Protein backbone atom coordinates (compact mmCIF):
# COMPACT_ATOMS: atom_id res chain seq x y z
CA UNK A 1 0.00 0.00 0.00
CA UNK A 2 1.62 3.21 -1.24
CA UNK A 3 2.19 5.86 1.41
CA UNK A 4 4.14 9.05 2.08
CA UNK A 5 6.34 9.96 5.05
CA UNK A 6 4.87 13.25 6.25
CA UNK A 7 7.60 13.63 8.87
CA UNK A 8 10.56 11.82 10.41
CA UNK A 9 11.15 12.07 14.16
CA UNK A 10 13.61 10.49 16.58
CA UNK A 11 12.54 7.86 19.10
CA UNK A 12 13.92 5.95 14.10
CA UNK A 13 10.16 6.53 14.02
CA UNK A 14 8.02 7.85 11.18
CA UNK A 15 4.55 9.30 10.67
CA UNK A 16 3.09 7.83 7.47
CA UNK A 17 0.05 9.11 5.59
CA UNK A 18 -1.24 6.29 3.43
CA UNK A 19 -2.86 6.73 0.03
CA UNK A 20 -6.12 5.91 1.86
CA UNK A 21 -5.98 9.43 3.37
CA UNK A 22 -5.12 8.34 6.92
CA UNK A 23 -1.91 8.94 8.87
CA UNK A 24 -0.36 6.34 11.18
CA UNK A 25 2.63 6.60 13.49
CA UNK A 26 5.24 3.87 13.06
CA UNK A 27 7.04 2.64 16.20
CA UNK A 28 9.77 1.33 13.89
CA UNK A 29 10.80 2.44 10.41
CA UNK A 30 10.53 -1.02 8.88
CA UNK A 31 12.75 -2.74 6.33
CA UNK A 32 14.49 0.42 5.07
CA UNK A 33 17.01 2.82 6.61
CA UNK A 34 15.76 5.91 8.42
CA UNK A 35 18.76 7.94 7.22
CA UNK A 36 17.84 7.39 3.57
CA UNK A 37 14.43 9.00 4.10
CA UNK A 38 12.86 12.42 4.51
CA UNK A 39 9.43 14.05 4.44
CA UNK A 40 7.47 13.41 1.26
CA UNK A 41 9.11 10.23 -0.05
CA UNK A 42 6.94 7.49 -1.53
CA UNK A 43 7.16 4.24 0.46
CA UNK A 44 5.23 1.00 0.06
CA UNK A 45 3.90 0.09 3.49
CA UNK A 46 2.04 -3.07 4.45
CA UNK A 47 -1.69 -3.22 3.78
CA UNK A 48 -2.63 -3.81 7.43
CA UNK A 49 0.57 -3.56 9.49
CA UNK A 50 1.21 -0.21 7.74
CA UNK A 51 4.96 -0.79 8.15
CA UNK A 52 7.33 0.46 5.47
CA UNK A 53 8.52 -2.42 3.28
CA UNK A 54 10.58 -0.61 0.63
CA UNK A 55 11.18 2.87 -0.73
CA UNK A 56 9.67 3.84 -4.05
CA UNK A 57 11.15 5.91 -6.90
CA UNK A 58 9.69 9.32 -7.68
CA UNK A 59 6.36 8.64 -9.37
CA UNK A 60 4.71 11.21 -11.65
CA UNK A 61 1.00 11.21 -12.43
CA UNK A 62 -0.12 10.64 -16.01
CA UNK A 63 -1.44 14.20 -16.13
CA UNK A 64 1.97 15.55 -15.10
CA UNK A 65 3.71 13.55 -17.83
CA UNK A 66 1.16 14.74 -20.39
CA UNK A 67 1.87 18.28 -19.14
CA UNK A 68 5.36 18.16 -20.67
CA UNK A 69 5.85 19.69 -24.12
CA UNK A 70 6.80 17.03 -26.66
CA UNK A 71 5.50 18.49 -29.95
CA UNK A 72 7.57 21.68 -29.48
CA UNK A 73 5.30 24.20 -31.25
CA UNK A 74 7.07 26.33 -33.85
CA UNK A 75 6.54 30.06 -33.25
CA UNK A 76 9.43 32.43 -33.90
CA UNK A 77 9.57 35.79 -32.14
CA UNK A 78 9.03 37.41 -35.55
CA UNK A 79 5.40 36.26 -35.32
CA UNK A 80 4.90 38.61 -32.35
CA UNK A 81 4.28 42.24 -33.24
CA UNK A 82 4.07 45.26 -30.98
CA UNK A 83 5.73 43.46 -28.04
CA UNK A 84 9.47 44.01 -28.33
CA UNK A 85 10.01 45.25 -24.79
CA UNK A 86 7.84 42.43 -23.40
CA UNK A 87 9.71 39.78 -25.40
CA UNK A 88 13.03 41.20 -24.21
CA UNK A 89 11.90 41.16 -20.57
CA UNK A 90 10.63 37.59 -20.84
CA UNK A 91 13.76 36.29 -22.56
CA UNK A 92 16.05 38.13 -20.14
CA UNK A 93 14.14 36.92 -17.07
CA UNK A 94 13.28 33.33 -18.05
CA UNK A 95 15.77 32.25 -20.77
CA UNK A 96 18.85 34.40 -20.14
CA UNK A 97 19.27 33.31 -16.47
CA UNK A 98 18.77 29.72 -17.64
CA UNK A 99 21.63 29.17 -20.10
CA UNK A 100 23.98 31.68 -18.44
CA UNK A 101 23.51 31.21 -14.67
CA UNK A 102 27.12 31.33 -13.49
CA UNK A 103 27.77 34.81 -14.87
CA UNK A 104 24.58 36.11 -13.27
CA UNK A 105 26.21 34.92 -10.05
CA UNK A 106 29.42 36.61 -11.21
CA UNK A 107 27.70 39.99 -11.15
CA UNK A 108 26.04 38.93 -7.88
CA UNK A 109 22.60 39.96 -9.18
CA UNK A 110 19.59 37.82 -8.33
CA UNK A 111 17.56 36.74 -11.38
CA UNK A 112 13.84 36.74 -10.54
CA UNK A 113 12.23 33.39 -9.80
CA UNK A 114 8.99 33.84 -11.75
CA UNK A 115 7.26 35.95 -14.37
CA UNK A 116 3.58 36.94 -14.40
CA UNK A 117 2.37 37.99 -17.85
CA UNK A 118 -0.83 39.96 -17.31
CA UNK A 119 -3.06 42.10 -19.49
CA UNK A 120 -6.31 42.29 -21.43
CA UNK A 121 -7.33 39.18 -23.38
CA UNK A 122 -5.78 38.84 -26.81
CA UNK A 123 -2.68 40.85 -25.94
CA UNK A 124 -0.32 37.96 -26.69
CA UNK A 125 0.40 36.31 -23.34
CA UNK A 126 -0.06 32.67 -24.36
CA UNK A 127 1.39 33.54 -27.77
CA UNK A 128 4.58 34.77 -26.10
CA UNK A 129 4.65 31.65 -23.92
CA UNK A 130 4.32 29.41 -26.97
CA UNK A 131 7.07 31.35 -28.75
CA UNK A 132 9.31 31.01 -25.69
CA UNK A 133 8.69 27.27 -25.72
CA UNK A 134 9.53 27.35 -29.43
CA UNK A 135 12.86 29.20 -29.23
CA UNK A 136 14.27 27.60 -26.06
CA UNK A 137 15.91 24.25 -25.38
CA UNK A 138 14.43 24.07 -21.88
CA UNK A 139 11.87 21.38 -21.07
CA UNK A 140 8.64 23.37 -21.16
CA UNK A 141 5.96 22.28 -18.68
CA UNK A 142 2.63 23.75 -19.75
CA UNK A 143 -0.51 23.62 -17.63
CA UNK A 144 -3.68 25.51 -16.76
CA UNK A 145 -5.29 26.71 -13.57
CA UNK A 146 -8.41 24.53 -13.88
CA UNK A 147 -6.17 21.47 -14.28
CA UNK A 148 -4.95 21.78 -10.68
CA UNK A 149 -8.48 21.51 -9.27
CA UNK A 150 -9.78 18.03 -8.48
CA UNK A 151 -12.55 16.44 -6.44
CA UNK A 152 -10.30 14.50 -4.09
CA UNK A 153 -8.77 16.32 -1.13
CA UNK A 154 -5.10 17.05 -1.67
CA UNK A 155 -5.19 15.94 -5.31
CA UNK A 156 -4.49 19.44 -6.63
CA UNK A 157 -1.61 19.97 -4.21
CA UNK A 158 -0.26 16.55 -5.16
CA UNK A 159 -0.60 17.49 -8.84
CA UNK A 160 1.35 20.74 -8.51
CA UNK A 161 3.94 18.99 -6.34
CA UNK A 162 4.56 16.34 -9.00
CA UNK A 163 4.65 19.02 -11.69
CA UNK A 164 7.33 20.95 -9.81
CA UNK A 165 9.25 17.75 -9.04
CA UNK A 166 9.27 16.78 -12.72
CA UNK A 167 10.45 20.32 -13.44
CA UNK A 168 13.28 19.82 -10.94
CA UNK A 169 14.34 16.53 -12.52
CA UNK A 170 14.93 18.22 -15.88
CA UNK A 171 17.59 20.83 -15.16
CA UNK A 172 16.51 23.30 -17.89
CA UNK A 173 12.77 23.26 -17.14
CA UNK A 174 10.17 26.01 -17.50
CA UNK A 175 6.72 25.85 -15.90
CA UNK A 176 3.91 27.74 -17.64
CA UNK A 177 0.78 28.01 -15.48
CA UNK A 178 -1.73 29.49 -17.90
CA UNK A 179 -4.97 31.01 -16.60
CA UNK A 180 -3.75 31.49 -13.04
CA UNK A 181 -7.12 32.97 -12.03
CA UNK A 182 -8.60 29.49 -11.55
CA UNK A 183 -6.44 28.78 -8.48
CA UNK A 184 -5.18 32.30 -7.80
CA UNK A 185 -8.47 33.65 -6.46
CA UNK A 186 -8.36 35.87 -3.39
CA UNK A 187 -8.64 34.05 -0.08
CA UNK A 188 -12.22 33.58 1.08
CA UNK A 189 -15.93 23.09 0.50
CA UNK A 190 -14.05 23.17 -2.79
CA UNK A 191 -12.69 26.56 -1.76
CA UNK A 192 -10.57 24.77 0.85
CA UNK A 193 -9.14 22.44 -1.81
CA UNK A 194 -8.37 25.32 -4.18
CA UNK A 195 -6.71 27.17 -1.30
CA UNK A 196 -4.63 24.09 -0.49
CA UNK A 197 -3.53 23.96 -4.13
CA UNK A 198 -2.61 27.66 -4.05
CA UNK A 199 -0.58 27.35 -0.84
CA UNK A 200 1.14 24.28 -2.27
CA UNK A 201 2.08 26.34 -5.32
CA UNK A 202 3.40 29.08 -3.03
CA UNK A 203 5.41 26.53 -1.03
CA UNK A 204 6.92 25.11 -4.21
CA UNK A 205 7.79 28.62 -5.41
CA UNK A 206 9.45 29.46 -2.08
CA UNK A 207 11.26 26.12 -1.84
CA UNK A 208 13.39 26.88 -4.89
CA UNK A 209 17.01 27.49 -4.05
CA UNK A 210 17.76 31.04 -5.23
CA UNK A 211 18.43 31.45 -8.97
CA UNK A 212 17.79 27.74 -9.53
CA UNK A 213 17.42 26.18 -12.97
CA UNK A 214 13.59 26.16 -12.87
CA UNK A 215 11.64 29.27 -13.87
CA UNK A 216 7.87 29.71 -13.65
CA UNK A 217 5.71 31.74 -16.04
CA UNK A 218 2.07 32.53 -15.26
CA UNK A 219 -0.55 34.31 -17.35
CA UNK A 220 -3.79 35.99 -16.34
CA UNK A 221 -6.35 38.33 -17.89
CA UNK A 222 -7.68 39.38 -14.46
CA UNK A 223 -5.07 40.50 -11.93
CA UNK A 224 -7.57 42.04 -9.50
CA UNK A 225 -8.85 38.49 -9.02
CA UNK A 226 -5.31 37.21 -8.42
CA UNK A 227 -4.40 36.69 -4.78
CA UNK A 228 -1.92 39.38 -3.66
CA UNK A 229 0.10 36.79 -1.73
CA UNK A 230 1.03 35.27 -5.10
CA UNK A 231 3.10 38.26 -6.23
CA UNK A 232 5.02 39.07 -3.01
CA UNK A 233 8.83 39.20 -3.23
CA UNK A 234 10.19 35.66 -3.48
CA UNK A 235 7.44 34.43 -5.81
CA UNK A 236 6.40 35.81 -9.21
CA UNK A 237 7.65 39.42 -9.32
CA UNK A 238 8.09 40.39 -12.99
CA UNK A 239 4.52 41.52 -13.62
CA UNK A 240 5.12 41.87 -17.34
CA UNK B 1 -13.36 -18.23 4.01
CA UNK B 2 -12.63 -19.99 0.73
CA UNK B 3 -8.91 -20.15 1.49
CA UNK B 4 -9.81 -21.38 4.98
CA UNK B 5 -11.88 -24.12 3.36
CA UNK B 6 -8.95 -25.07 1.12
CA UNK B 7 -6.44 -25.29 3.97
CA UNK B 8 -8.93 -27.23 6.09
CA UNK B 9 -9.26 -29.64 3.15
CA UNK B 10 -5.46 -29.91 3.10
CA UNK B 11 -5.55 -30.72 6.82
CA UNK B 12 -8.35 -33.29 6.48
CA UNK B 13 -6.17 -34.97 3.86
CA UNK B 14 -3.93 -36.27 6.66
CA UNK B 15 -6.77 -37.11 9.07
CA UNK B 16 -10.52 -37.08 8.49
CA UNK B 17 -11.12 -35.41 11.89
CA UNK B 18 -8.83 -32.38 11.51
CA UNK B 19 -10.74 -29.63 13.32
CA UNK B 20 -10.28 -25.93 12.57
CA UNK B 21 -10.71 -23.31 15.29
CA UNK B 22 -11.44 -19.65 14.54
CA UNK B 23 -10.74 -17.05 17.23
CA UNK B 24 -11.74 -13.39 17.28
CA UNK B 25 -9.44 -11.54 19.71
CA UNK B 26 -11.26 -8.18 19.55
CA UNK B 27 -14.79 -9.58 19.65
CA UNK B 28 -13.61 -11.70 22.61
CA UNK B 29 -12.73 -8.58 24.58
CA UNK B 30 -14.76 -9.39 27.72
CA UNK B 31 -16.15 -12.36 29.64
CA UNK B 32 -17.49 -13.52 26.28
CA UNK B 33 -14.88 -15.55 24.40
CA UNK B 34 -15.96 -15.89 20.77
CA UNK B 35 -14.42 -19.16 19.57
CA UNK B 36 -15.69 -21.88 17.24
CA UNK B 37 -14.59 -25.25 15.88
CA UNK B 38 -15.39 -25.94 12.22
CA UNK B 39 -15.07 -28.92 9.90
CA UNK B 40 -15.95 -29.09 6.22
CA UNK B 41 -19.20 -30.46 4.84
CA UNK B 42 -18.52 -32.73 1.88
CA UNK B 43 -20.52 -31.04 -0.88
CA UNK B 44 -21.10 -34.44 -2.50
CA UNK B 45 -22.87 -35.61 0.67
CA UNK B 46 -25.18 -32.59 0.37
CA UNK B 47 -27.15 -34.45 -2.32
CA UNK B 48 -25.94 -38.04 -1.86
CA UNK B 49 -27.29 -38.02 1.69
CA UNK B 50 -28.75 -34.97 3.43
CA UNK B 51 -27.13 -33.44 6.51
CA UNK B 52 -23.57 -34.49 7.45
CA UNK B 53 -24.14 -34.96 11.17
CA UNK B 54 -26.19 -37.64 12.89
CA UNK B 55 -28.32 -36.55 15.84
CA UNK B 56 -28.20 -39.52 18.22
CA UNK B 57 -28.41 -37.33 21.34
CA UNK B 58 -29.47 -33.85 22.42
CA UNK B 59 -25.91 -32.70 23.22
CA UNK B 60 -25.43 -30.94 19.88
CA UNK B 61 -28.62 -28.91 19.58
CA UNK B 62 -28.11 -26.86 22.77
CA UNK B 63 -26.28 -24.18 20.75
CA UNK B 64 -27.44 -21.73 18.10
CA UNK B 65 -25.22 -20.88 15.11
CA UNK B 66 -24.40 -17.21 14.65
CA UNK B 67 -25.85 -15.33 11.67
CA UNK B 68 -22.35 -14.37 10.51
CA UNK B 69 -21.49 -18.04 10.02
CA UNK B 70 -24.69 -18.80 8.09
CA UNK B 71 -24.03 -15.81 5.82
CA UNK B 72 -20.44 -17.01 5.39
CA UNK B 73 -21.55 -20.60 4.95
CA UNK B 74 -22.30 -22.53 8.15
CA UNK B 75 -24.23 -25.78 7.56
CA UNK B 76 -23.56 -25.60 3.78
CA UNK B 77 -19.80 -26.17 3.41
CA UNK B 78 -18.54 -26.27 7.01
CA UNK B 79 -20.31 -27.30 10.21
CA UNK B 80 -19.66 -26.05 13.73
CA UNK B 81 -18.45 -28.33 16.52
CA UNK B 82 -19.52 -27.56 20.08
CA UNK B 83 -16.79 -25.96 22.18
CA UNK B 84 -15.94 -27.57 25.53
CA UNK B 85 -13.34 -26.19 27.96
CA UNK B 86 -11.35 -28.89 29.75
CA UNK B 87 -10.56 -27.05 32.99
CA UNK B 88 -9.40 -28.82 36.15
CA UNK B 89 -8.05 -28.03 39.60
CA UNK B 90 -4.39 -26.93 39.88
CA UNK B 91 -5.26 -25.06 36.69
CA UNK B 92 -8.22 -23.20 38.20
CA UNK B 93 -6.66 -22.44 41.60
CA UNK B 94 -3.64 -20.96 39.81
CA UNK B 95 -5.80 -18.57 37.78
CA UNK B 96 -7.54 -17.37 40.97
CA UNK B 97 -4.28 -15.60 41.85
CA UNK B 98 -4.52 -12.88 39.18
CA UNK B 99 -6.80 -11.03 41.61
CA UNK B 100 -6.15 -12.83 44.89
CA UNK B 101 -6.41 -9.94 47.40
CA UNK B 102 -3.47 -10.74 49.70
CA UNK B 103 -4.15 -10.65 53.43
CA UNK B 104 -3.00 -7.03 53.81
CA UNK B 105 -6.00 -5.55 51.98
CA UNK B 106 -8.31 -7.48 54.31
CA UNK B 107 -7.03 -5.45 57.27
CA UNK B 108 -6.38 -2.03 55.68
CA UNK B 109 -8.50 0.68 57.30
CA UNK B 110 -8.81 2.74 54.09
CA UNK B 111 -8.14 6.36 55.11
CA UNK B 112 -10.54 8.27 57.33
CA UNK B 113 -10.42 11.51 55.31
CA UNK B 114 -12.05 10.33 52.08
CA UNK B 115 -14.08 7.81 54.09
CA UNK B 116 -15.63 10.71 56.01
CA UNK B 117 -16.08 12.68 52.78
CA UNK B 118 -17.81 9.71 51.11
CA UNK B 119 -20.03 9.22 54.16
CA UNK B 120 -21.00 12.91 54.14
CA UNK B 121 -21.70 12.91 50.39
CA UNK B 122 -23.87 9.80 50.59
CA UNK B 123 -25.71 11.22 53.60
CA UNK B 124 -26.47 14.47 51.76
CA UNK B 125 -27.64 12.76 48.58
CA UNK B 126 -29.69 10.46 50.81
CA UNK B 127 -31.30 13.45 52.51
CA UNK B 128 -32.30 14.74 49.08
CA UNK B 129 -33.54 11.28 48.06
CA UNK B 130 -35.46 11.02 51.34
CA UNK B 131 -37.13 14.32 50.51
CA UNK B 132 -38.07 12.81 47.15
CA UNK B 133 -39.32 9.61 48.82
CA UNK B 134 -41.37 11.68 51.28
CA UNK B 135 -42.97 13.45 48.33
CA UNK B 136 -43.61 10.14 46.57
CA UNK B 137 -45.34 8.66 49.62
CA UNK B 138 -47.48 11.61 50.68
CA UNK B 139 -48.67 12.16 47.11
CA UNK B 140 -50.35 8.70 47.24
CA UNK B 141 -52.56 9.57 44.27
CA UNK B 142 -55.27 6.93 44.07
CA UNK B 143 -56.29 7.30 40.41
CA UNK B 144 -55.57 3.63 39.67
CA UNK B 145 -52.41 3.36 41.83
CA UNK B 146 -51.18 0.26 39.98
CA UNK B 147 -50.91 2.49 36.91
CA UNK B 148 -48.93 5.35 38.49
CA UNK B 149 -46.72 2.59 39.87
CA UNK B 150 -45.85 1.75 36.25
CA UNK B 151 -45.92 5.21 34.61
CA UNK B 152 -43.16 6.55 36.88
CA UNK B 153 -40.63 3.72 36.52
CA UNK B 154 -37.36 5.30 35.41
CA UNK B 155 -34.88 3.90 37.93
CA UNK B 156 -35.70 6.80 40.23
CA UNK B 157 -36.33 7.85 43.87
CA UNK B 158 -38.68 5.25 45.43
CA UNK B 159 -36.52 2.14 45.95
CA UNK B 160 -33.59 1.95 43.51
CA UNK B 161 -31.86 5.23 44.36
CA UNK B 162 -33.14 4.43 47.88
CA UNK B 163 -31.80 1.80 50.29
CA UNK B 164 -29.27 0.57 47.72
CA UNK B 165 -27.46 3.68 48.94
CA UNK B 166 -28.33 2.58 52.50
CA UNK B 167 -26.80 -0.77 51.57
CA UNK B 168 -23.58 0.88 50.36
CA UNK B 169 -23.31 3.16 53.40
CA UNK B 170 -24.05 0.39 55.91
CA UNK B 171 -21.67 -2.07 54.24
CA UNK B 172 -18.83 0.47 54.11
CA UNK B 173 -19.34 1.60 57.71
CA UNK B 174 -19.63 -1.95 59.07
CA UNK B 175 -16.55 -3.13 57.18
CA UNK B 176 -14.51 -0.12 58.31
CA UNK B 177 -15.57 -0.48 61.95
CA UNK B 178 -14.94 -4.23 61.98
CA UNK B 179 -11.49 -3.75 60.45
CA UNK B 180 -10.74 -1.04 63.02
CA UNK B 181 -11.67 -3.33 65.91
CA UNK B 182 -9.68 -6.16 64.33
CA UNK B 183 -6.49 -4.11 63.99
CA UNK B 184 -6.88 -2.54 67.44
CA UNK B 185 -7.15 -6.06 68.86
CA UNK B 186 -4.54 -7.94 66.82
CA UNK B 187 -1.89 -5.20 66.71
CA UNK B 188 -1.13 -4.60 70.40
Amino acid sequence: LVSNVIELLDVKCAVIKTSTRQTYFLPVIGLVDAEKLKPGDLVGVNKDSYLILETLPTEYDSRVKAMEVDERPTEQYSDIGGLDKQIQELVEAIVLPMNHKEKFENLGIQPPKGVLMYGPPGTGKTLLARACAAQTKATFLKLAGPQLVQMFIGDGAKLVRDAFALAKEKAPSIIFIDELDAIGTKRFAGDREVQRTMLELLNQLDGFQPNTQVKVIAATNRVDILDPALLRSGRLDRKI
Amino acid sequence: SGVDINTQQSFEALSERAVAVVVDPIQSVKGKVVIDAFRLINANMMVLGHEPRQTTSNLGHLNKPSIQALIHGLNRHYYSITINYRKNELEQKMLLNLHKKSWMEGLTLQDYSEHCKHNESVVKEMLELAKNYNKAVEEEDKMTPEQLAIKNVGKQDPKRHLEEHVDVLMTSNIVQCLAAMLDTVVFK
Binding site: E92, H100, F104, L107, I109 | -
Partner: protein, 39 residues
Protein backbone atom coordinates in the same frame (compact mmCIF):
# COMPACT_ATOMS: atom_id res chain seq x y z
CA UNK C 1 13.30 52.60 -7.07
CA UNK C 2 16.91 52.54 -5.86
CA UNK C 3 16.89 48.74 -5.52
CA UNK C 4 15.41 48.35 -9.00
CA UNK C 5 17.87 50.79 -10.59
CA UNK C 6 20.74 48.91 -8.94
CA UNK C 7 19.30 45.73 -10.46
CA UNK C 8 18.64 47.42 -13.81
CA UNK C 9 22.21 48.69 -14.15
CA UNK C 10 23.33 45.08 -13.80
CA UNK C 11 20.61 44.10 -16.26
CA UNK C 12 22.17 46.56 -18.70
CA UNK C 13 25.53 44.92 -17.97
CA UNK C 14 24.12 41.50 -18.96
CA UNK C 15 24.39 42.67 -22.55
CA UNK C 16 28.10 42.24 -23.34
CA UNK C 17 30.47 40.43 -20.95
CA UNK C 18 30.67 43.40 -18.54
CA UNK C 19 31.23 41.95 -15.06
CA UNK C 20 31.20 45.51 -13.67
CA UNK C 21 28.90 48.47 -14.17
CA UNK C 22 30.26 51.81 -15.35
CA UNK C 23 29.13 55.30 -14.37
CA UNK C 24 27.54 55.74 -17.80
CA UNK C 25 25.67 52.49 -17.12
CA UNK C 26 24.24 53.77 -13.83
CA UNK C 27 23.34 57.02 -15.58
CA UNK C 28 21.50 55.07 -18.28
CA UNK C 29 19.72 53.03 -15.61
CA UNK C 30 18.51 56.09 -13.68
CA UNK C 31 17.53 58.07 -16.77
CA UNK C 32 15.51 54.98 -17.72
CA UNK C 33 13.85 54.21 -14.38
CA UNK C 34 13.20 57.70 -12.98
CA UNK C 35 11.46 58.54 -16.27
CA UNK C 36 9.77 55.14 -16.69
CA UNK C 37 8.27 55.56 -13.22
CA UNK C 38 6.34 58.56 -14.57
CA UNK C 39 4.41 56.17 -16.83
Amino acid sequence: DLRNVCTEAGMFAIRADHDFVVQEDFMKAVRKVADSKKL
